[PDB]
Symmetry: D2
Subunit: 377 residues, 4 copies
Amino acid sequence: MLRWITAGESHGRALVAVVEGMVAGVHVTSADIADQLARRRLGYAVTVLSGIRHGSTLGGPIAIEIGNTEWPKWETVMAADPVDPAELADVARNAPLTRPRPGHADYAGMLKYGFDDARPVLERASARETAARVAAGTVARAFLRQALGVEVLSHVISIGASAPYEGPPPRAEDLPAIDASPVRAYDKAAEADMIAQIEAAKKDGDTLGGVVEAVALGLPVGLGSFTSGDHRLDSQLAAAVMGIQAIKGVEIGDGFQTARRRGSRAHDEMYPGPDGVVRSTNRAGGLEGGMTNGQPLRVRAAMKPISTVPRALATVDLATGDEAVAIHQCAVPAAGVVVETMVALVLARAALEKFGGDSLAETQRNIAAYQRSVADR
Amino acid sequence: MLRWITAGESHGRALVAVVEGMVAGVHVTSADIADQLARRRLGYAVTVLSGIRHGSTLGGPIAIEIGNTEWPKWETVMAADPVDPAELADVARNAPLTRPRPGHADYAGMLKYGFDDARPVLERASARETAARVAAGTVARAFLRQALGVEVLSHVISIGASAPYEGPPPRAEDLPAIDASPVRAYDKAAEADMIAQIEAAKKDGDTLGGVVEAVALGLPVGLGSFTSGDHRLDSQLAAAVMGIQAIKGVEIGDGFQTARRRGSRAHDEMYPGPDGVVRSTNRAGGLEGGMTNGQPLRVRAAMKPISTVPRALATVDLATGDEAVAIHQCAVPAAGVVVETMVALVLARAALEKFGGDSLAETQRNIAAYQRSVADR
Amino acid sequence: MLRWITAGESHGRALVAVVEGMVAGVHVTSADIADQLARRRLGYAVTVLSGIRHGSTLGGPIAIEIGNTEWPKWETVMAADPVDPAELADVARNAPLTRPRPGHADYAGMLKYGFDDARPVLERASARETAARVAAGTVARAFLRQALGVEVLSHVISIGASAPYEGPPPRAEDLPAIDASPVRAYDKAAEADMIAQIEAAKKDGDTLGGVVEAVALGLPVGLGSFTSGDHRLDSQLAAAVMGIQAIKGVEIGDGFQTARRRGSRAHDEMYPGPDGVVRSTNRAGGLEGGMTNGQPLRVRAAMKPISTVPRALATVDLATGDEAVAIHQCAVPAAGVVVETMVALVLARAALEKFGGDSLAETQRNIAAYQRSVADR
Amino acid sequence: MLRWITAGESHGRALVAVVEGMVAGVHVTSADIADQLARRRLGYAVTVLSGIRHGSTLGGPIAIEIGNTEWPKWETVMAADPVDPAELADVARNAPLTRPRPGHADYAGMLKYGFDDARPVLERASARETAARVAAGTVARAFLRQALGVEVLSHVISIGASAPYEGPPPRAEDLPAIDASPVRAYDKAAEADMIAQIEAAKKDGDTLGGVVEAVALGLPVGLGSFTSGDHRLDSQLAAAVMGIQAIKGVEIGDGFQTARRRGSRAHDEMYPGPDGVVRSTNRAGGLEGGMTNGQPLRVRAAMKPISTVPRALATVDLATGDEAVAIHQCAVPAAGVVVETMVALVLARAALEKFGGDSLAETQRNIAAYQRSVADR
């Protein structure tokens, strides 16, 4: 049973991702992880410490370290061990952060943990942590591809007030074009609209959020279950995606728009096919009653504008109780990449749950046999 | 650490809800549970078996049984023990269900579990299970009220193509009026619009979904955490709400609309107040960076139309591979009630996580002290 | 992933066992459960509410209710709902329990939960709860037999000061003789010694504990893992067995005696065989480095004397702070039966972890294929 | 809710310990961790990557890296990324390991994971992993001391055939003398006996196991619970201790010897005292009915001889199916140190479970208040 953990402060020495429960024999390398970390940097130092040998998973815990290049600047302010308080009071960088940014973990985090300073909160809350997620996600990704022939990608639906691209989702062969787009858009018209919204926001010195859609292709029928709320795959995906920094909404398939349609036009009808049932629409986004139906999985995430707009947001100085202005510390296309990663981690877990196995070869045997059994129906 | 489990088939003898980890000394009765089960039946036999003594929780597992009144009709078809297969083949009610309904667990469930018959799938997948959830939810509810003075309610935002009510959410004092509404609407104009959509759908012999909003009031700052994706309260709520039958989307606060706003207008600014920070908007829906900020928690759920529209939905007969039509087996206002329940279960768990305690009095002491500590800031 | 929960107070209306995550298609009936509950009653009303249809598991949560026959006597004192406090003060049975028994949950439970009365503590702490465990255990048992040809049994090693039977463990064919023994002894000489110890203790009006050994036969190699402490099968078994009421020690195989042997004589040497490796000793008790090695699994549990000895044990009246004497509310052979049950639950979970599957047939395919793969080595 | 994870192969680049859920404000440093790692090396390079700032925990995940000094020798054989298979076949160090050692994870691990080589199994299974545990344990240790004034230590009861020290356990002030002993013995006579057994085994070229006892002092009443098997503190401790490499048995207090006593002499009687109940014996080892009773917690672990005895143990070459002899790759006093660590991790988790809190100060308030409440009884 797959588990993943991230660790690290934004300005700490390094980030760590640990993945536990991954079967032995999955091919994945430092380079794969770096490639995926590079994809996270798209939009307008990796060390594998354990669990992988000669590019193949060992079956034990996989620990992946991501170095922080800025560490020399932070090694006193973010030092693990005590530092002379007199030497530290002379360090401008160590100044108190007492003006919580609206929209961020600052205020609630300070109160919750009894902090006088927001620094310990933002260091961990920061979306720099998503880099560790992506390191972990790459392992799930390699597993999904090699065990199931499953591919995970994403594309941006809207940024700011752009008109949502509601056409067909991309396939895996479209990923280079998507990744090459400044807004990771699949649709050229939608692309132009989004770039325009960004240009105008940039000019106004403002910030934007957006909507992104992860797509997983090639899934077998029956991952997740209808047996309880927690086992529904959409429940698990929603947790994994909503828990991403700045995400305020999650949809499966046509999501909130489904809730505005009539039953006669809301669902995906089934028809006879050569190698099983075929559907002509995918309004469900590949999930029905908590399980994969074989159609492309579509998961959409709504990201709020996350970058603090300079001198726009009133706040309070918790030190004084006086009015203040939040001092700043779009990322929509990268959010799409992070969503891919969380979707992959969840899918990989659900796959190991149904197909079991301790090595890829074993898991592959069980998959094959389940597929043969379904075909023989 | 609070856990909840539901058990039961729709036409089985009874449903069971088990709640584990609830502190001793919470006042809750059979009548409370029945009251909340009654609320679930709003819209256009309870036996407490364990864990409660004289209307006060014991600290052990709380098992709540909900009887099925139709059991005599089903006691052979849904018999636990073997039944002579010749006697059963003469029972019309035991006929094979081999035409999976689009939008339901039928097809994927049959394939996943190797079933030839959809009966075992729909029996457990059916939203009749939400009654067991609500039994469990009532315990969390009583805890939230008595430990924290927290109230949970809901109201319907839209049904079918109605214009979404986007005005202010209701307070606890508005619940009778909401519950008295045929569509559990808070807004009279929105109400009329929704009733109209329903009337027209009824006439067309069609079905509707909708959007509902659970509201939790009185929450302390700091439930949930920013420390990882799984600990974010919005992550937990999303899992609990998305896992409800027929839910296709979840939002916190202004959700997907936040993703279409500029940073300067997207967030909730903070200002000085007498007894702490005050905000003038609640676009975040009471959650920031994974934690409660003290504002009303707003959680919205998108429900797809769930009732099968007679002779509209093409499907396949899995027995033959031939075309077929799905045979049928809005519920928006009741969905709102179920969402309340899932929100309450999650909030109660997060509260016990931060405030600990083995009895209500102990948990109340820790709450009080945390609140004093925050006030003294 | 198998989970089990028990609920119920000793004098409550009923006990409930819930088992979640069990694959569909396992044959098990009310009668099987009753048979195993009967075995628990060896030594000197079952209702299946959910998850089983026509004697075959459905794949959903399995809820099993066990009625309390004494309920009419307790329905006011252990009433779930409030009862007039004046009517209750006239009930002798509802008298305060304020003299905690040494060796029991009484004192620590009262302090922990802020109880003035030990009643809520002993009602849940009581070993009557093991009946619910055994109901749950029967499902795991049926699964182990049908999926893996695995059998679980037990026998008593010692009671009181008897000389421990250290000969060979029994096989499944020996269970009737063991069950027919007044002390569930496998060895006739050991039996006579144990009966003598009991006779002498009975005469002295005293109580005894003992040591029991669960044996699981037919296990495949490789359940559990060496990958971390929590995944070691011996870790899981130890948790499941030590958590049984009155158990103070757990051993795998030769346990504490292994720690007194030299490395040259402590382990089980391997030799070539026709259908795989064979060992001539089983000092390890079928577990090495956290995993099953194919040898009989042997798990031993040390039970303390649990029955309070009348007027022997000094205690304190918490109401007054005055000296008092504990007022009483062997069971070694039944402990053996309970240990069987906990071993079976853990083994079944570990099996589903490695072999996966959502139905027995699927799990059986994966098992077969893993076994073929091992044979082809 | 405290969680701990270890990662690393014995000859990999480094070990990683991650601790999640630890409250903010606990004072612990690199030096503390190194000190405790040094204690693990008693008997006949630490880098804190995250979660700690200026010697005080941040509340987020704490990642601790322990470097392997031998890494340059292993950086090709245990390289994470692929290495030219022709270059690797010339490396003597990379030779196949196909003769599983009796008593080790080798055989079952190879079969389970489909390995042809035991290397991936022993790399992770090796007790070198306990160093990562101890890094994690140090955090729990600091928490226990600062939140609860709790101290954890250990001493060796027996090694090989020595006569078990059954006198009183040590207190915290005795730790230097214990740590200074070659066998970490508390008792001088027992010490001499153990050294003799070792001398004789060394001379015979053989290996020994032993029994160790962890002692935790200063615990509040009521950690753990009687509410179910999994919540019993003895259940949790047993899992944590049995899961240590080479441990074959666990006891609480007088353990297996309790099972040989009569009820009248088996338990710890309670008597009136100035500041609460007092006991004159501690046969229970500080745990009753699943919870701490305030007495010293005593947990004993039986370690099998772990070092392979050269040319004594027959095995099979899995490559050929031919007879072979196991080639080798006491540690009792260090086992005691590891047991301390696992006990501390479990106690710290149980403490956070009851007392909650997100910072030490908050947890301390809740502790104080629970203690006052108990005193006022």
